[PDB]
Design an enzyme around this catalytic site. Structure first.
Site, short mmCIF file in Angstrom:
data_model
loop_
_atom_site.label_atom_id
_atom_site.label_comp_id
_atom_site.label_asym_id
_atom_site.label_seq_id
_atom_site.Cartn_x
_atom_site.Cartn_y
_atom_site.Cartn_z
N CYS A 65 38.77 16.19 -27.15
CA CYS A 65 38.87 16.88 -25.87
C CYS A 65 37.85 17.99 -25.66
O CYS A 65 37.80 18.95 -26.43
CB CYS A 65 40.28 17.42 -25.63
SG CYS A 65 40.46 18.28 -24.05
N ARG A 68 38.90 21.95 -23.95
CA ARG A 68 39.85 22.74 -24.72
C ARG A 68 39.78 24.25 -24.53
O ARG A 68 40.66 24.95 -24.98
CB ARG A 68 39.77 22.39 -26.21
CG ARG A 68 40.56 21.14 -26.59
CD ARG A 68 40.49 20.88 -28.09
NE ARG A 68 39.22 20.28 -28.48
CZ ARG A 68 38.74 20.27 -29.71
NH1 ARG A 68 39.42 20.85 -30.70
NH2 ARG A 68 37.57 19.69 -29.97
N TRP A 237 42.20 18.45 -15.07
CA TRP A 237 41.42 17.86 -13.99
C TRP A 237 40.38 16.93 -14.60
O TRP A 237 40.17 16.93 -15.81
CB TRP A 237 40.75 18.94 -13.13
CG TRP A 237 40.03 19.97 -13.93
CD1 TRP A 237 38.79 19.85 -14.50
CD2 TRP A 237 40.51 21.28 -14.27
NE1 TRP A 237 38.47 21.00 -15.17
CE2 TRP A 237 39.50 21.90 -15.05
CE3 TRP A 237 41.69 21.98 -14.00
CZ2 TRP A 237 39.64 23.19 -15.56
CZ3 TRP A 237 41.82 23.26 -14.50
CH2 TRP A 237 40.81 23.85 -15.27
N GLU A 242 34.02 10.62 -16.10
CA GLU A 242 35.11 9.71 -16.41
C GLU A 242 35.32 8.76 -15.25
O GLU A 242 35.63 7.59 -15.45
CB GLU A 242 36.39 10.49 -16.66
CG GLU A 242 36.34 11.49 -17.78
CD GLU A 242 37.65 12.24 -17.90
OE1 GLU A 242 38.61 11.63 -18.41
OE2 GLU A 242 37.73 13.42 -17.46
C1 HEM Z 1 41.69 20.92 -17.73
C2 HEM Z 1 40.71 20.02 -17.75
C3 HEM Z 1 40.47 19.02 -18.83
C4 HEM Z 1 39.29 18.35 -18.96
C5 HEM Z 1 38.11 18.52 -18.05
C6 HEM Z 1 39.40 17.46 -20.07
C7 HEM Z 1 38.36 16.60 -20.46
C8 HEM Z 1 38.63 15.52 -21.29
C9 HEM Z 1 37.83 14.35 -21.39
C10 HEM Z 1 36.55 14.07 -20.65
C11 HEM Z 1 38.40 13.53 -22.31
C12 HEM Z 1 37.88 12.18 -22.73
C13 HEM Z 1 38.68 11.16 -21.92
C14 HEM Z 1 38.17 9.75 -22.05
O1 HEM Z 1 36.99 9.51 -22.36
O2 HEM Z 1 38.95 8.80 -21.81
C15 HEM Z 1 39.57 14.16 -22.77
C16 HEM Z 1 40.39 13.58 -23.71
C17 HEM Z 1 41.56 14.21 -24.09
N1 HEM Z 1 42.08 15.36 -23.61
FE1 HEM Z 1 41.33 16.53 -22.33
N2 HEM Z 1 40.63 17.56 -20.61
C18 HEM Z 1 41.33 18.51 -19.93
C19 HEM Z 1 42.66 18.92 -20.15
C20 HEM Z 1 43.49 18.46 -21.18
C21 HEM Z 1 44.85 18.75 -21.37
C22 HEM Z 1 45.69 19.62 -20.47
C23 HEM Z 1 45.27 18.10 -22.54
C24 HEM Z 1 46.62 18.08 -23.16
C25 HEM Z 1 47.37 19.17 -23.31
C26 HEM Z 1 44.14 17.40 -23.05
C27 HEM Z 1 44.13 16.63 -24.19
C28 HEM Z 1 43.22 15.58 -24.31
C29 HEM Z 1 43.47 14.49 -25.26
C30 HEM Z 1 44.64 14.34 -26.20
C31 HEM Z 1 42.45 13.63 -25.13
C32 HEM Z 1 42.27 12.36 -25.92
C33 HEM Z 1 43.06 11.21 -25.31
C34 HEM Z 1 42.86 9.97 -26.15
O3 HEM Z 1 42.78 10.03 -27.40
O4 HEM Z 1 42.78 8.86 -25.58
N3 HEM Z 1 43.09 17.64 -22.20
N4 HEM Z 1 39.70 15.40 -22.16
C1 LIG Z 2 44.26 15.37 -20.09
C2 LIG Z 2 43.05 14.60 -19.63
C3 LIG Z 2 42.09 15.22 -18.83
C4 LIG Z 2 40.98 14.48 -18.42
N1 LIG Z 2 40.02 15.02 -17.64
N2 LIG Z 2 40.85 13.19 -18.81
C5 LIG Z 2 41.77 12.57 -19.59
C6 LIG Z 2 41.53 11.12 -19.95
C7 LIG Z 2 42.31 10.60 -21.16
C8 LIG Z 2 42.20 9.08 -21.19
C9 LIG Z 2 42.05 8.35 -20.00
C10 LIG Z 2 41.94 6.96 -20.02
C11 LIG Z 2 41.98 6.29 -21.24
C12 LIG Z 2 42.13 7.01 -22.43
C13 LIG Z 2 42.17 6.29 -23.73
N3 LIG Z 2 41.02 5.38 -23.82
C14 LIG Z 2 43.47 5.51 -23.91
C15 LIG Z 2 43.61 5.23 -25.38
C16 LIG Z 2 43.80 3.93 -25.84
C17 LIG Z 2 43.91 3.70 -27.21
C18 LIG Z 2 44.12 2.30 -27.73
C19 LIG Z 2 43.83 4.78 -28.09
C20 LIG Z 2 43.63 6.07 -27.59
N4 LIG Z 2 43.55 7.13 -28.42
N5 LIG Z 2 43.53 6.26 -26.26
C21 LIG Z 2 42.24 8.39 -22.40
C22 LIG Z 2 42.89 13.27 -20.01
CL LIG Z 3 40.87 8.05 -16.23
#
Ligand code: HEM
Ligand SMILES: Cc1cc(N)nc(CCc2cccc([C@H](N)Cc3cc(C)cc(N)n3)c2)c1
Ligand SMILES: [Cl-]
Ligand code: HEM
Ligand SMILES: Cc1cc(N)nc(CCc2cccc([C@H](N)Cc3cc(C)cc(N)n3)c2)c1
Ligand SMILES: C[C@H](O)[C@H](O)[C@H]1CNc2nc(N)[nH]c(=O)c2N1
Ligand SMILES: C[C@H](O)[C@H](O)[C@H]1CNc2nc(N)[nH]c(=O)c2N1
Ligand SMILES: [Cl-]
Lengths: 362, 362
Positions: A65, A68, A237, A242
């Site tokens: 993330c 953060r 947001w 993305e």
């Molecule tokens: C406030 C604005 C936020 C932005 C701009 C942001 C940005 C991102 C982005 C770009 C990703 C990659 C997503 C992808 O490629 O699919 C991501 C993943 C992630 N974000 Fe954030 N995020 C935000 C808030 C949060 C919040 C509120 C949480 C949880 C409390 C969080 C937890 C995570 C987690 C767990 C992932 C990984 C999800 C996965 O493994 O598939 N983020 N974030």
């Molecule tokens: C809080 C938040 C903020 C933000 N700006 N963007 C997001 C996007 C998160 C997200 C979205 C689509 C798919 C996946 C992930 N690609 C879904 C996925 C699939 C599998 C198999 C494993 C794994 N770890 N994850 C994770 C989240």
């Molecule tokens: Cl998405």
């Protein structure tokens, strides 16, 4: 073994949590109370303070993330009290409303009762609360391919999509005790959508693209001191990439680059023309411009990476080890233009955190 | 210990090499001859066949290399015979000429005598045979910052650069026995350079950018069956991004994006405008167009990734495990538009291979 794992996770968590909250003296007494409670009930219950801060610690330890920096301002909604599917439904409806905040998006997490003996109390089927359906039959491709299996699952349960490219999937979830999940159509008034337009290419509207305002993940488990909250949807947001570089661009998603190349008036014939690269930039400019014009929160990848650098700096100042996943933190466009690309990160897993979990359909 | 390490590496290498060359029956006899030779001289000498193929195996096992599809066509020049600095100089001069091939670049490696007891026979100081100098004094920045320490080192030895942004560094290398290295000015007739122009933005020429035609790495050690060829410069052709997305774009390199933004007529004021992204694409289009117009080999990152996919396919067909470094294989622009971004790779080290080594200056 199971009892011991929980205890160990709790000792570690409480000490670390109370340490940050300036409550190190309360750790001794609290750990006792917990140790008796696990001895008794097979588990323990978090205080509201422990829960809110564990949610925040968990965001901070999300290696993948980039956003953060704002971990400490996460808005936590404690819904461990729900017992009915009308209550879960309304809680989800509310989370959407409050987090959206008319476009001024608030990072929010709603937390439902945790797994008992690994037994889920509430089982959400959605990947995200707001998402578009997808259909593929007879070589005919409609909507979002990423949603195909959940779409068919819904349609097993008697839901029917209009089969536009942007059908909002209904909320679908299952309660402990029920063999089947229920589904509820999302009220259009709860959901903000943004039509995609380009700042100065007027023809861009002909693509008739759009995307939802708020990404609300509902398929990850929050683990906090040994307690497993399988149902804890959270949102921030969007980062522009993305939507523009992945959701609308990928061949396995909406696959719009060739069409974008056409409306921006370039040829999609030669690799050396970098038409995909150029379409990518214009489409990502379109996405940023469109959300800004609508008053919906969004961050561009340069600003996000700037913010993330402050987060690395902040972790050093606080004496906290930083962890991260380089492969996810780099943005999928112009990554070498961010500081992230040029350093490396320790990808260790620290708890609390969010973990992916198996979905029940497929 | 040392004798044993060499033997072990040789057993592994010869067997694998003769296996591919359809010479499995010759392995027994050859290993004997080698075992006696190490018993005698403290080392062993490769046959021309073993050397050429080890060079090729080594390219194929380069995890960070996207251009590996053509590993088997590497042109190998066996220069283990050189004893004089005039001979090394001429060998280097020749490698430049033959590899450049009037623009139709041939992937080539020249191989000099190997380390004896870790003792180098030939010690090349250049990072690449062809490279621009760099100067920073009194806040004044001239040329390529990446070359600053080698530039000062040369100027210690009595070389003097004109201090343009594109001074060709001289060849600089040290022979076993000499306390100092020698340096030789590169003949301008040996070196192809490409002025950067844009296909349709005429103002782009005002930047007066240019780059050399052939990247020839001269700071990596080739290790082949326990034998260490510290001096074995090799080349391919450029992938457009290396020039446009890194060498000319990086803040720590030529840092030209703002200037590019100006000539392509866009503002460099707002992150949400994606001006850096857009400048990046136009500059990379410029680089591709410019090399093509001059008749100098070059590959764009889409084609390269297409080629690399064939290489993965080819490795599967040949029953060879594939290895790679995901973080280097993804191109620094539009990475998610390539197949590479979406799979993962085993980053194990397999020998033969090329390994970075400490430079003597700094
Ligand atoms: C406030 C604005 C936020 C932005 C701009 C942001 C940005 C991102 C982005 C770009 C990703 C990659 C997503 C992808 O490629 O699919 C991501 C993943 C992630 N974000 Fe954030 N995020 C935000 C808030 C949060 C919040 C509120 C949480 C949880 C409390 C969080 C937890 C995570 C987690 C767990 C992932 C990984 C999800 C996965 O493994 O598939 N983020 N974030
Ligand atoms: C809080 C938040 C903020 C933000 N700006 N963007 C997001 C996007 C998160 C997200 C979205 C689509 C798919 C996946 C992930 N690609 C879904 C996925 C699939 C599998 C198999 C494993 C794994 N770890 N994850 C994770 C989240
Ligand atoms: Cl998405
Ligand atoms: C023929 C065209 C070739 C192309 C297009 C190509 C492409 C590339 C690219 C883009 C990189 C990354 C460079 C960087 O980011 O700095 C790279 C690295 C590398 N290539 Fe190739 N390459 C080619 C030929 C070769 C040859 C002939 C060899 C050696 C026999 C080779 C071995 C390597 C090695 C060892 C690296 C890693 C260098 C390091 O660790 O710093 N490649 N290649
Ligand atoms: C054959 C070939 C073909 C091609 N198209 N491109 C290239 C570029 C190779 C290269 C160039 C500059 C800098 C580095 C590397 N960044 C130099 C380097 C430094 C350090 C400390 C470690 C390490 N492993 N490497 C590697 C090579
Ligand atoms: C430390 C970090 O991994 C570093 O920025 C790497 C990333 N991937 C790369 N990839 C290429 N092609 N070239 C590089 O110099 C780097 N640098
Ligand atoms: C398997 C491979 O690492 C995969 O493509 C990853 C790369 N990095 C990523 N980064 C982000 N932000 N999102 C993703 O879905 C992925 N996928
Ligand atoms: Cl280079």
């Amino acid at each position: 073994e199971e009892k011991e794992i929980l205890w160990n996770e709790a000792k570690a968590f409480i000490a670390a949590c109370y340490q940050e909250l300036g409550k190190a003296a309360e750790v001794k007494d609290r750990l006792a109370d917990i140790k008796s409670e696990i001895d008794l009930t097979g588990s323990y219950v978090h205080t509201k303070e422990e829960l809110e801060h564990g949610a925040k610690m968990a965001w901070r330890n999300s290696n993948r993330c980039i956003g953060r920096l704002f971990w400490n301002s996460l808005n936590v909604i404690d819904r461990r009290d729900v017992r009915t599917k009308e209550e879960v439904r309304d809680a989800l409806f509310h989370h959407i409303e409050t987090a959206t905040n008319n476009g001024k998006i608030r990072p929010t997490i709603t937390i439902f009762p945790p797994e008992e003996k690994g037994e889920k109390q509430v089982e959400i089927w959605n990947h995200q609360l707001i998402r578009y359906a997808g259909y593929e039959s007879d070589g005919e491709r409609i909507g979002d391919p990423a949603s195909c299996s959940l779409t068919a699952a819904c349609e097993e349960l008697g839901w029917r999509g209009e089969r536009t490219d942007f059908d909002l999937l209904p909320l679908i979830f299952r309660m402990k005790g029920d063999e089947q999940p229920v589904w509820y159509e999302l009220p259009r008034s709860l959901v903000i959508e943004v039509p995609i337009t380009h700042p100065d290419i007027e023809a861009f509207s002909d693509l008739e693209l759009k995307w939802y305002g708020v990404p609300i993940i509902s398929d990850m488990k929050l683990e906090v001191g040994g307690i497993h909250y399988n149902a804890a949807p959270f949102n921030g947001w969007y980062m522009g990439t993305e939507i523009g570089a992945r959701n609308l661009a990928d061949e396995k998603r909406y696959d719009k680059l060739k069409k974008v190349a056409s409306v921006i008036g370039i040829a999609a014939d030669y690799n050396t023309d970098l038409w995909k690269d150029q379409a990518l930039v214009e489409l990502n400019k379109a996405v940023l411009h469109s959300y800004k014009k609508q008053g919906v929160s969004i961050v561009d990848h340069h600003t996000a990476a700037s913010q993330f650098k402050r987060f690395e700096e902040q972790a050093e100042e606080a004496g906290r080890k930083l962890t991260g996943d380089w492969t996810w933190l780099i943005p999928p466009i112009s990554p070498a233009a961010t500081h992230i690309f040029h350093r490396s990160y320790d990808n260790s897993i620290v708890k609390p955190n969010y973990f992916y979990q198996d979905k029940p359909y497929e």
